[PDB]
Ligand binder design. Sequence first.
Ligand SMILES: O=C(O)[C@@](O)(COP(=O)(O)O)[C@@H](O)[C@H](O)COP(=O)(O)O
Ligand SMILES: O=C(O)[C@@](O)(COP(=O)(O)O)[C@@H](O)[C@H](O)COP(=O)(O)O
Ligand SMILES: O=C(O)[C@@](O)(COP(=O)(O)O)[C@@H](O)[C@H](O)COP(=O)(O)O
Lengths: 123, 123, 467, 467, 316, 151
Amino acid sequence: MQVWPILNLKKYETLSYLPPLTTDQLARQVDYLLNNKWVPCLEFETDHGFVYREHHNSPGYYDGRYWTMWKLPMFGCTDPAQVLNELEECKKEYPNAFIRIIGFDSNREVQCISFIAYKPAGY
Amino acid sequence: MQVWPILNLKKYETLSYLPPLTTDQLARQVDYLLNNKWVPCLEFETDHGFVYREHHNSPGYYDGRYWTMWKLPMFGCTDPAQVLNELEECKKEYPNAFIRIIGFDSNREVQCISFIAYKPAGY
Amino acid sequence: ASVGFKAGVKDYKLTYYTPEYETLDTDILAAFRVSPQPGVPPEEAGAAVAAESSTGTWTTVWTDGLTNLDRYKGRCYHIEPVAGEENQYICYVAYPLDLFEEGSVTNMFTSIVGNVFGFKALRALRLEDLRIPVAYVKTFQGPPHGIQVERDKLNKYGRPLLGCTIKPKLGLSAKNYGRAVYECLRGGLDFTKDDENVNSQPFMRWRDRFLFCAEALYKAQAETGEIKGHYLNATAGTCEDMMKRAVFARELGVPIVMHDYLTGGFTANTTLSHYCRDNGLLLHIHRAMHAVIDRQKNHGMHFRVLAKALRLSGGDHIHSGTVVGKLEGERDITLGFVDLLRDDYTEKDRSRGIYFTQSWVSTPGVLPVASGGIHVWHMPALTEIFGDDSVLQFGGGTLGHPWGNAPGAVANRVALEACVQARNEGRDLAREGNTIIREATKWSPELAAACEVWKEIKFEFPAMDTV
Amino acid sequence: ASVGFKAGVKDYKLTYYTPEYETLDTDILAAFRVSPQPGVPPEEAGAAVAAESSTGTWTTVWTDGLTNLDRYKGRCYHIEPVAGEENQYICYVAYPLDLFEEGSVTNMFTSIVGNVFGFKALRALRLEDLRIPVAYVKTFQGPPHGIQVERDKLNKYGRPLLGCTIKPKLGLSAKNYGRAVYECLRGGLDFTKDDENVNSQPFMRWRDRFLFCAEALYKAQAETGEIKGHYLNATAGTCEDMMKRAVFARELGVPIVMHDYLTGGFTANTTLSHYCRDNGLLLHIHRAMHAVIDRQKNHGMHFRVLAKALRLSGGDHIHSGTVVGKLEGERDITLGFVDLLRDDYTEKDRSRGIYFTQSWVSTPGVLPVASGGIHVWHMPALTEIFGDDSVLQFGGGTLGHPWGNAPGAVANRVALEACVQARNEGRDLAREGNTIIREATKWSPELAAACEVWKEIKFEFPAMDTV
Amino acid sequence: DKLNKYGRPLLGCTIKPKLGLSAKNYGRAVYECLRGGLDFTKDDENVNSQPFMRWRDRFLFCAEALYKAQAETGEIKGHYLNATAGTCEDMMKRAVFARELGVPIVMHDYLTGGFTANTTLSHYCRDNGLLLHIHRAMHAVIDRQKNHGMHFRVLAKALRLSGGDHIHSGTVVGKLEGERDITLGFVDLLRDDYTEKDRSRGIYFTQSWVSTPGVLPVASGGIHVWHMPALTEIFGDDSVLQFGGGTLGHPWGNAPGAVANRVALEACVQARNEGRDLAREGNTIIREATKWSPELAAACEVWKEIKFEFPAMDTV
Amino acid sequence: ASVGFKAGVKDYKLTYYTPEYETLDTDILAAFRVSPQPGVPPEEAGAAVAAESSTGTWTTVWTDGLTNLDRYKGRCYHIEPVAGEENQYICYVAYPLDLFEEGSVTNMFTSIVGNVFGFKALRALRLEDLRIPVAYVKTFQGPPHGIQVER
Ligand SMILES: O=C(O)[C@@](O)(COP(=O)(O)O)[C@@H](O)[C@H](O)COP(=O)(O)O
Ligand SMILES: O=C(O)[C@@](O)(COP(=O)(O)O)[C@@H](O)[C@H](O)COP(=O)(O)O
Ligand SMILES: O=C(O)[C@@](O)(COP(=O)(O)O)[C@@H](O)[C@H](O)COP(=O)(O)O
């Protein structure tokens, strides 16, 4: 019987309970997003990697949901290499930031993909 | 006339105003719990050893009452050694945690025993 | 079926003495200790009590024929002489469920105890017990929280809770009240409290007190790491004033308020009990004035009836006596009503004055509170009599300590924990009590100083209320 | 000026027995009938009572030094032995005005009568009287209306008012209740009323009753040309329920509601009293449960104290006993508290049990109500004892008439008016009572029929509560 | 958007036993489930306010527990607090206290509580930002038999109009009845803006919704880790999968039981996204994950042979 | 008294079929007309109905040990075949008073009739009658007026 750890066990939503993604596994996720015709976009955050409540406590209100946009959504992108390229570029500029890849479905206007692609040191 | 100290005098509920329990005194408390047919269980906490109020201030609401369960309550346990064994095991895994032993009365559904069995360094 | 109407007076026993009656499980049963005037037969006296507290009057009325009196009348169904008492009897009366308003203790007492105690034909009358049927029990909310929930909210387990009444009773300012409160709480007491008569007065207005006490309790809680409470008194002159006080306690986020249910009244108490359930406030109940009613064996109402009424109306704690303190309370009678307050079921037991078996259908239990003239040397006895589910209060026993409030609190907390540890190890609190306290004084200077002061203080006098 | 703090217990008499004290006009004074345990000196017993009901506790507390105990402490200032009684004394205790919450009878009783009756050191304790200073009296509203205003609203002058309690007590439907009501009112009674325990029950819910009773009272008023009333019971389980009932009575435009002040409680009663003043409703008060407290001479609280408390909290009528009826009430003691209820000033008079002179600074008087086992033959005596300012109620005495309610009402109204006329002409009601009734039966068939039925009915038994 | 959850079905768990637990034990179970990876925990449908646990005490302890699990994991959590009550007034009092606590979601039993009460609650939730989970308790009394009653698809349309953010829709593979094609039919009626007539799925009429929001279908009832591939394949990302016995029945307790379910779900999402056939490769995907997840391996051993297969009464 | 926790599924009849049970006057009693699927014994079907409408679920949960399931569980205490009907039985189930919210018909039906009618293991289910104990009846207002008052 193992006891589920309590310390340093912050999670990052979708895919975060699986072993870390290898380069190929990451590329496969990006392919999936592009094959479904979703628009890829990168977001990064340096100060608040997790949700909190500073400005309000009403139902459904949380601070920390919005991260900052890396450039613009990649409308028309058809090559996964372009996305992975932007990821490396974002990492070089913000090595201390959490970085996630999201994919928009514009007909429903909902993010159909969202996963952490890079975490700063000690995370 | 002695002045009751103000600093570093945090307490831990039942039995905490007595001199620290020796091994035998601890074993006696566990015996008492088992003799009354109560179910033993260990709980540990590393981050908030004391009650506080972060999420709400209404009557009867406090944060920090819930600690984390070590494995599962020991249903059917009849030997104090099993409890003391789990205590040592919990201590080796969480040397930096506060650890308490509780005993459940399932007919009334109330904890009839609860005492701190281990405190981290500097407490 | 109906017979004609004949005007005139007839004996009550013709309609209300019913010795062959088998009680229904929905009937409210009452055990009355009746002392008739010379020349009044016990059957007539018991019948008069049953008639006057239910449907009848002194002369025949034609309107009885418009209903079915057989289904509504109270009935004296059993009479037994009292041993070692001159011309005194225990009369059992049954009242149909239909006579009572649902959820109203006020209505229940109005019928059963409203006019019968003044009958010229009786010398004295005492209500000893009432069997409240489960069907009537279900019409009441009962305690806002009850034992289990209270321990869970406060995170306190494995020992009696400790409290302290601030003294002097009256005369302290709001700020001095809070100062005393912080010092008591920081020494290990779980609770402090307004005295029962501390409401709102020229020397200290209620809102100022609530405010300073909240500041003091939060400071003691931060210092010790244990949850603290200070019972704020909501007792007031009107329902409106009572509600204003409960509302401010809610705003402060404190855990507990108090009410004097007999002097404030059942109607007001039930309103407060409902408010506490809706707002998560624990409700401590004082029984101020009870001894005016329940002390004498020949006349009045036994406390066990008043205790049952409180469990129905609602309260999380209720004062229950100390047995060993300054106020009267015999051990067996006390253990009897303590069971009636905490348990889900208590079987008839005449040796403890329990006339009827009583079930509560999961109505929460009430925490008994021992308060009044107790000190450290009484700790083993209190722990042994009440067990873990009780609150032990030390007013003079804390504020009378030679080194002050915090050390006075430490002495009480250490004495209590020494007793809990000893009991848990298998020691006999009854035989080894003094030894357990003495052992603790070797390592606790605070306890040693308290023990020196109260060593010879005992309260022993013959009791008036005995089985 | 301050002396050190010495922990330990000291006799209460050292601080609370103060025989040289001159009472202030702002002090609340209490006369306690104290029965100490063997070996407890009267000075210590009186001092214990004064201490425990004011500022003290069982051991010395350091906090006394934070205030000026001399200005707050209760003081036993006089003790006198009771004649023809073993080891019993009348102890007089003075309480400073500052100890009490303004306008709160609940607070006043909590202090004075809260815990002292249970002291192990006393065998028994009874509160006989209280001198309420005019400065405290002014903090209360008192009766919503009072005698003068009530007679003015109803346009009734020159004779006692007449009422009737509907019977059987419980068991009648809402429609049958109204039917009985109309028949009683149309025969000459001014009022009919819900019995004290008629609240809201399975056989008759309150709103249905209020509705049918309003229909019945309006019909009787139109028929006779005299203003009528039916006391609608507002007594309930919670403050909220009580208010809902008072509110519907207001909507119906009826003139009077009733409340059981002791079973409902002072807090709820004061709320209702204020509501009645704000809405023009007369308030009839029942003293249900009083005998549980005030019957025995050795222990409890005398009714005169409960009567004063009601005049402060508020009520337009209050049951006061009949003297000659089925419930206990001695003539002199009764006349004593009737004066305390109606007059603006009553001088000390130990022969009537009045321990202190009491002034009311124009607080309205309360109408005493005689009810319980009375009939036509008692009319001369009732008129003579109470005079015009009273309400005489005949429940069985109306509904027990052989020809029904209307004739039963006529018999009572005729008997009353025959007595008023005789008295006004100079006849001695005490010597000529039976003759006056007999003369009236010659021309009133209704009265003659009532007289035949109750001719031999008297209620005579030794009283328990005597001066 | 409010919960910040994307790319996978949401995971929940009903606390068990259904009735009988105290308020404090309810919260203890809740914290342990949430900290292991479940997004939600919930009051069972019949947990309202009873002698063993009054509603306000439960709401309070559950809020403490959910906030602790959220702080520990860094993921937004919720515990559906039941507002179902005997009167409109009682229902409103419960919804109001949930609002005061700042929690994100409440629940209601729309058929036993009723449409009139449900519509009132739906409006209150819109005005106060509370998500509304809907239970269909009692539906089978009405919709099970093919010859008499009302089909569930009609009850589902009624709920989408009256209002609810989630509605139980059956599991197909669990302990309660639900045929695959009929289920897919009404799931489309709950989520999409337009569904064309299709008699093979029991859809008699073409239905348009003019942008009325879609409702999240909830699969609950006798499901466990081995059913994960099938559930993911049938419902897709927009669904909530609930495991009551499937979490609290895990040999190591609630947190590990939660981990097993979260890992199994994510293993299926990753496999699907990589192009694997959940229908053909389901068991293989689960087995692969057990190699690195002790929590999942322990769950798989226990429920390996548990299936629920009986002839359905409601067929097209 | 407590036994260890063994994960896994057990038959409902082991805990919920209780033919020796004497009903209490405070129990809500239900008479269900049960039609099991082929191969499901009537005792198991009745036990499943009792379990699912009260305290149980499909697999063993450790939390049962935190309470006293004996005082809360629904119990199938009697089963009788229906005359002139194929594989149909009347199963009597007892529910303790504590399971119900006072004054709430909504809560009463949610438990008794909430999920059991959809069990794959049953072909059909009908609730024929309920014995509402007087202690529960008293928690309801009932008709605003009733026959007598209306007339
Ligand atoms: O005024 C008093 O006497 C107390 O404040 C105790 O003070 P000490 O702690 O200083 O004795 C009350 O709590 C009584 O105990 C009430 O009596 P009971 O509990 O019997 O109702
Ligand atoms: O229940 C009763 O006995 C009465 O209804 C009178 O009925 P009858 O008129 O038929 O006698 C009450 O008014 C008592 O008089 C109250 O006692 P007190 O006035 O002494 O408070
Ligand atoms: O009582 C039950 O059976 C559940 O709590 C599931 O428990 P388990 O998770 O332990 O199976 C309900 O959510 C049903 O699933 C409702 O049925 P439906 O979803 O078909 O409306």
